[PDB]
DNA sequence: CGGCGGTACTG
DNA sequence: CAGTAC
DNA sequence: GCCG
């Protein structure tokens, strides 16, 4: 119900600019403001009406006026010419703002320049090889097929293994950027040392095509981030993320993996205000932090058998996954 | 003034 | 560790 | 960038 497209559309450009240039916190600031402007049913009409909105300050409001009066944003006319290129570069999986700026500094301007002259990490080479594929979203139906493929291979050597697709899929989105599969076991122990068996099985059938993050020399590997592709014609390579967690950490793992990211952050920001701490591992109470919000004391873990418990313990009304898109 | 989430790999 | 990612 |  965004009644401010002509405002946000201009700010979103400025937000991405700051983000690719590495100005993370300023970009965060814009992100929340833009998010707000898309929830305010009524189109802001005053410099005051703006300030009155959570996530919008004087600085933000001021430029909302220039867009309301001048119909344009002077700032947008002074965005470095490097931005489009930095965004192109940072869209390579494994390359971030630091690598993008370095490459730009070295004179690179195109993926052809990267391909032929840039020094790439193993991850970046895989990301460049699937540059277009990784920017595409798949229909959820395909995500289902991928989850099913992973689940089938998992339950093959242990029918007790519980498998659930999380991320945007569980939140009910029509399309998914990748597939997030959480795996755990109700007996609280058979979930150990399975990555070896599962990944091996998924490779045997040729389902996995590339590995981005897979610390298989360690028996305590928690996640696998890779690339897969279903069989048959017209198939594209898709990003696949898999996490194996202890049953005791199931709810926190599920909540985390379901997101959204912004939802997780506000949830964790809240827990911190209540002297608590939430992670994909567990919800803790009586956590000791210093003047800089740094955890100095671990506190203790609270029993959270279900997601409802997490919300409850935080003094919050439960939210269906679909209601966690922020 | 100064935090803005809390984690897990890589090299 | 810094960088990048979920 | 916002905000306590
Ligand atoms: N910075 C981040 C990124 C991700 N996540 C968590 C919440 C996400 O829902 C989940 C999976 O990450 P994805 O990047 O796959 O996010 P989504 O699945 O939500 O979106 P997409 O549809 O783009 O895959 O990991 C997080 O807590 N913090
Ligand atoms: Mg996802
Ligand atoms: Na406000
Ligand atoms: Na990237
Ligand atoms: Na993901
Ligand atoms: Na590895
Ligand atoms: Na400025």
Rounded CA-CA distance A127/A114 in Å is: 12
Whether the Cβ atoms of residue A282 and residue A221 lie closer than 8 Å to each other = no
Which 192-231 residues of chain A approach strand C with CB closer than 7 Å? 225
The dihedral sign for the CA sequence A264, A269, A273, A278: positive
Q: Residue A100: is it exposed, middle or buried by C-beta count within 10 angstroms (0-12/13-18/19+)?
A: buried
Pairing of strands A283-285, A288-289: unpaired
CA distances from A158 to A104, A153, A155, A190, A251 (A): 49, 9, 5, 8, 21
How many angstroms from the chain centroid is the CA of residue A253?
Answer: 14
Give the sheet arrangement for strand A223-228, strand by strand: A162-165, A179-184, A238-244, A223-228, A208-213
CA distances from A24 to A15, A29, A30, A167, A265 (A): 9, 9, 10, 23, 15
Pairing of strands A277-278, A238-244: unpaired
* 3-class state of residue A212 by DSSP: strand
Q: Single out the catalytic residue among A24, A58, A63, A272.
A: A63
Rounded CA-CA distance A201/A47 in Å is: 60
CA distances from A124 to A89, A127, A171, A183, A234 (A): 10, 5, 29, 27, 25
Q: Kindly give the residue spans of alpha helices, DSSP state H, lying in A162-279.
A: 167-170, 195-204, 250-258, 261-273
Nearest residue to C5 (CA, C1')? A94
Instruction: For residue A192, give the DSSP letter.
Output: T
Whole-number Å distance, CA A19 to C1' D1?
11
Whole-number Å distance, CA A281 to C1' B7?
9
Domains of chain A: 1-82 (1.10.150.110), 83-136 (1.10.150.20), 137-259 (3.30.460.10), 260-326 (3.30.210.10)
Show the beta-strand stretches assigned E in A137-205: 138-139, 162-165, 175-176, 179-184
Rounded CA-CA distance A285/A316 in Å is: 15
What method was applied to determine this entry? X-ray
CB of A25 lies under 7 Å from some atom of strand D: yes
Whether the Cβ atoms of residue A163 and residue A150 lie closer than 8 Å to each other = yes
**A284-322 b/e with 16+ CB inside 10 Å = b?**
beebeeeeeeeeeeeeeebebeebebbbebbeeeeeebe
CA distances from A123 to A115, A119, A210, A214 (A): 13, 12, 9, 11
Rounded CA-CA distance A55/A38 in Å is: 11
Rounded CA-CA distance A264/A258 in Å is: 9
> Is position A63 annotated as part of the catalytic site?
yes
Beta bridge partners of A208: A228
The closest nt to A29, taking CA to C1', is D1
Nearest residue to B5 (CA, C1')? A265
Pairing of strands A179-184, A238-244: parallel
The closest nt to A166, taking CA to C1', is C6
The dihedral sign for the CA sequence A285, A164, A96, A260: negative
CA distances from A148 to A67, A79, A142, A184, A199 (A): 48, 45, 10, 15, 14
Rounded CA-CA distance A7/A72 in Å is: 9
The closest nt to A89, taking CA to C1', is C4
Residue matched to tokens 């049913």: A41
How many angstroms from the chain centroid is the CA of residue A270?
Answer: 19
- The secondary element (H helix, E strand) that includes residue A159 is none
Residue A216: CB partners within 8 Å, gap ≥ 6? Answer: A195, A196, A199
Give the sheet arrangement for strand A283-285, strand by strand: A277-278, A283-285, A300-301
Whether the Cβ atoms of residue A36 and residue A16 lie closer than 8 Å to each other = no
Q: Is the minimum distance from the CB of A321 to ligand 1 under 6 angstroms?
A: no
Which 256-315 residues of chain A approach strand C with CB closer than 7 Å? 261
Q: Of A247, A246, A252, whose CA–CA distance to A302 is shortest?
A: A252
Q: Which two tokens stand for residue A312?
A: 């409850």
Rounded CA-CA distance A184/A161 in Å is: 6
Residue A190: CB partners within 8 Å, gap ≥ 6? Answer: A158, A160, A161
Q: Which two tokens stand for residue A121?
A: 């990490």
Rounded to 5 degrees, what are φ and ψ at A294?
-90, 130
Protein residue with its CA nearest to atom 7 in ligand 1: A259
Beta bridge partners of A175: A139
Beta bridge partners of A215: none
Residue A11: CB partners within 8 Å, gap ≥ 6? Answer: A30, A33, A34, A37, A63, A73
Rounded CA-CA distance A195/A223 in Å is: 8
Cis, bond preceding A97 (omega within 30 deg of 0): no
Residue A250: CB partners within 8 Å, gap ≥ 6? Answer: A184, A305
Residue matched to tokens 């699937």: A130
Whether the Cβ atoms of residue A221 and residue A242 lie closer than 8 Å to each other = no
């Amino acid at each position: 119900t965004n009644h401010n497209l002509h405002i946000t559309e201009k700010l979103e450009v400025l937000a991405k600019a700051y983000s690719v240039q590495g100005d993370k916190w300023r970009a965060l600031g814009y992100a929340k403001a833009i998010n707000a402007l898309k929830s305010f049913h009524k189109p802001v009409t005053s410099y005051q009406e703006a300030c009155s909105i959570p996530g919008i300050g004087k600085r933000m409001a001021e430029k909302i006026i220039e867009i309301l009066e001048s119909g344009h944003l002077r700032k947008l006319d002074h965005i470095s010419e490097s931005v489009p290129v930095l965004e192109l570069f940072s869209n390579i999986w494994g390359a971030g703002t630091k690598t993008a700026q370095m490459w730009y500094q070295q004179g690179f301007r195109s993926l052809e320049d990267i391909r032929s002259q840039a020094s790439l990490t193993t991850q970046q080479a895989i990301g460049l090889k699937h540059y277009s594929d990784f920017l595409e979203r798949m229909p959820r139906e395909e995500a289902t097929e991928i989850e099913q493929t992973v689940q089938k291979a998992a339950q093959a050597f242990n029918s007790g293994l519980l498998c659930v697709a999380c991320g945007s899929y569980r939140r009910g989105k029509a399309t998914c950027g990748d597939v997030d599969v959480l795996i755990t076991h109700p007996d609280g122990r058979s979930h150990r040392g399975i990555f070896s068996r599962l990944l091996d099985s998924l490779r045997q059938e040729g389902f996995l095509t590339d590995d981005l993050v897979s610390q298989e020399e360690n028996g305590q590997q928690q996640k696998y981030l890779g690339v897969c592709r279903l069989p048959g014609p017209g198939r594209r390579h898709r990003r696949l993320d898999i996490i194996v967690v202890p049953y005791s950490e199931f709810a926190c793992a599920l909540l985390y993996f379901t997101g959204s990211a912004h939802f997780n952050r506000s949830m964790r920001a809240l827990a911190k205000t209540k002297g608590m701490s939430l992670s994909e591992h567990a919800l803790s109470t009586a956590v000791v932090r210093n003047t800089h919000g740094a955890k100095v004391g671990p506190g203790r873990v609270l029993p959270t058998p279900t997601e409802k418990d997490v919300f409850r313990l935080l003094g919050l009304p439960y939210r269906e996954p679909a209601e966690r898109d922020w």
